[PDB]
Amino acid sequence: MLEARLEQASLLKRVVDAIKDLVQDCNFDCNDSGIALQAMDNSHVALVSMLLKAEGFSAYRCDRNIALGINLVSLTKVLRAAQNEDILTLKADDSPDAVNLMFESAETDRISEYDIKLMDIDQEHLAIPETEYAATVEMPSAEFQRICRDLNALSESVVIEATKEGVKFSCQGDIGSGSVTIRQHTSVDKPEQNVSIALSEPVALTFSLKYLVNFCKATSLSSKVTLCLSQEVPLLVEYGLGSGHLRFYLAPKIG
Amino acid sequence: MLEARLEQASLLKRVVDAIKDLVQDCNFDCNDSGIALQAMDNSHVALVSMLLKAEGFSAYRCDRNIALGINLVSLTKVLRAAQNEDILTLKADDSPDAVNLMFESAETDRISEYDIKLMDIDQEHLAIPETEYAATVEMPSAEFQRICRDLNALSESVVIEATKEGVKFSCQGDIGSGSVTIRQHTSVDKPEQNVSIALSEPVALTFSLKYLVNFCKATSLSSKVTLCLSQEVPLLVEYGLGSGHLRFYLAPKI
Amino acid sequence: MLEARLEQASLLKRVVDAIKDLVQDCNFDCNDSGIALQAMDNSHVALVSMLLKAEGFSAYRCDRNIALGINLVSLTKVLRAAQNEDILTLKADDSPDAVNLMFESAETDRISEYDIKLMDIDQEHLAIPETEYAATVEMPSAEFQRICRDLNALSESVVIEATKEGVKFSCQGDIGSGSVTIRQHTSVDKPEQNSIALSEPVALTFSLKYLVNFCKATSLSSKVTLCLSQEVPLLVEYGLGSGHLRFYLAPKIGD
Amino acid sequence: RRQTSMTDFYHSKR
Amino acid sequence: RRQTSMTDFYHSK
Amino acid sequence: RQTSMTDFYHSK
């Protein structure tokens, strides 16, 4: 039934690395559109939504929808044996008990093959309607990661404030208080340094910094990150994949 | 009151990293001359004396002398948030309860601001008279650091022996005994890597290796270190800063 | 009695690093042929046999045979104080209580001297006859190390199975089953070569933790040789230039 | 005072 | 099922 | 024995 091939294995490895520390056991839902994933963490504070579209694969074939329950720690152990360059192929049969992974290297004749046992996972999926966000901030992913780490050194919580001016991340803790302010910045030379802010109405929300630091482990998937905020819904942190996407949703702190 | 601007935030980061493991809570005494520091460890075995001269800041202003009591671990947590090249600004008010740190980068217009709460530190300062040392050794800081780590792997104490020929560091321990001998070495090609000995009379002293290893965390501040020895005075280990200095004093074992 | 001078301190450091996690306390037997070592691990499952030939020293002199009993952890502590390019000199007398180490550097005039106390070790040496192996595989040491780590993440045991076409490493475990197949590959390349000399096919099972310990000798040579036959332990050999470092691994039987 | 849950905002689906 | 020993194959010398 | 810094310099 299922045969899904990546030209570069890196895409899968980073994706797994960007998910496994937030949620360990996930169902990869496979259909004609591709391979999707949605999972909440054990505390139900964050939600991961991944889509790897059939467009990104050499050869996508799936006549029957199937949920592949995978422990991502085991998957990471197996994926460590594949280089970023390796040609990767997932295969699965009709009512599968395991997923077959094949890594092929060039100029070597070396072939690696693994049969990873699947597991039964009861994953609570949520319906997320399309939202028109009050604020959308596109910024360098490494910059957001640096800000998150820096403020996490000082506090458990961060206030994100989006106004026409710019975006302010602020925190308070025993050591004192800190803040990082970014203004929308356009570079003629190098546009990965760009910060764009599309804002219909100002918005201010508080979030857990450890969850954001976990989110930022997807930095290797894209040089750009998009933060979508509005007052009454969880924060959206989106990384584009080229042909798919990885989204993290974070419920706010209120009191 | 106080507004002091550093060109590379790196200098302050190196200094704090070079002090924090010997003394955690320090008073930064700020006056027209600049920012100074003197502190003993809790055992009163070692003494740190830092001076950052006002000339080294790209705008130094201090209207009234003030001691900023800072926990250097918290300060390190805050200072990691600045790259070595960030433009750094310290500020403080009249009866300050906190120190304001501001990090600025070019081509971004990104602003980082932190307000670190100050703490009350009761400063016991010691009078250090100018001394004419029996021996003065100029050597690569990295070489001294390697020697200290190597001998610390085997022993808690090191004997330092300065003669006209050279300097011997020796130690003994359960595994056995070790020693490193350096001679006066002058290269025209790479003089970062020179060894100078100015000696009026030979000198032999014993010191704690853990304290010297702590001292050597200042290696990043200068490729060069100076060791000053005489029998009746503590050892002086000095790192030049360009616009100031960082000195460590170590009482001997007798 | 004993004075042995190495031009590069690196050789001894790497060699000790490749042994200490397998056997901690070793006798260095010094004679006119050079410095040899043979030691079994505490479980008697693996055996290390090192020879540093007298030819590899810039001055080797041994008036009387001597067994230098050395704790390799202490030896590593002392050898860390020498850079890879330091001129190293070992000295010992007739009835020694310690070994004298001298490190000298060029363009510096700094001399380091250490006297490591010896210890009394009763090491059981085994007679290993010259063997004609059913299969001899020459392959890049880094590749073998990577394979060993990858499979050790997944299993306790590995089946090494050699045929005329190529060599298969396979494993089984709770996560599933895996395999890496290398084919005989002759490119001018350099250390990418992979050669199999085989009289009869052979398949044996071995402990992966011991092989991972073996692979700590990777820094000694870009090439590793695996020698297999059905009735004797596996031989994993790293050439030294000066002699050799061999590891022997007894197989697992009756799976 | 309260860390909200994702299920506070979005309903369960199949 | 059984990890053999080096001493199963080579005798002491 | 390990001496103290206050044995060499007075407090001021």
Residue numbers in the entry:
A (entry chain C): 1 to 255
B (entry chain B): 1 to 254
C (entry chain A): 1 to 194, 196 to 256
D (entry chain F): 142 to 155
E (entry chain D): 142 to 154
F (entry chain E): 143 to 154
Sentences from the paper on this structure:
The DNA replication process is a desirable target for an antifungal product; hence, A. fumigatus proliferating cell nuclear antigen (afumPCNA) has been hypothesised as a fungal target for the development of new antifungals. The PCNA processivity factor is also known as the sliding clamp, as DNA slides through its central cavity. PCNA functions as a docking platform to allow DNA polymerases and a host of DNA replication and repair machinery to interact at the replication fork. The PCNA homotrimer comprises two domains, with each containing two alpha helices and nine beta strands, connected by a motif known as the interdomain connecting loop (IDCL), which forms part of the PCNA surface with which binding domain proteins interact.
The p21-derived peptide (139–160) was previously shown to bind to afumPCNA via fluorescence polarization with a KD of 3.1 µM. Previously, a shorter scaffold of this 22 amino acid p21 peptide was derived and synthesized: p21µ (141–155). It is 14 amino acids long, and it retained high-affinity binding, which was used to construct a library with variations relative to PIP-box residues as a rational starting point for the investigation of the fungal binding site. The co-crystal structure of afumPCNA bound to the p21µ peptide supports the hypothesis that A. fumigatus adopts a PIP-box sequence as a method for proteins to interact with afumPCNA. Here, we present an investigation of extensive structure–activity relationships between designed p21-based peptides and afumPCNA and the first crystal structure of a p21 peptide bound to afumPCNA, demonstrating that the A. fumigatus replication model uses a PIP-box sequence as the method for binding to afumPCNA. Differences in the protein sequence of afumPCNA and hPCNA account for the shift in affinity with the conservation of the secondary structure of the peptide. There is structural conservation around the 310 helical secondary structure and PIP-box, with more variability on the N- and C-terminus likely due to the mobility of the ends of the peptide and changes in IDCL residues. One prominent example is residue His125, which forms an antiparallel β-sheet with the C-terminal residues of p21 peptide on hPCNA (139–160); however, in the afumPCNA structure, afumPCNA His125 obstructs the formation of a favorable side chain hydrogen bond with the His152 side chain of the p21 peptide (139–160). This has the effect of pushing the C-terminus to be quite distant from the protein’s surface while not forming the hydrogen bonds of the β-sheet as observed in the human structure. There is also the loss of 3.4 Å hydrogen bond interactions between hPCNA Gln131 and the Tyr151 phenol of p21µ in afumPCNA as this residue is Thr131.
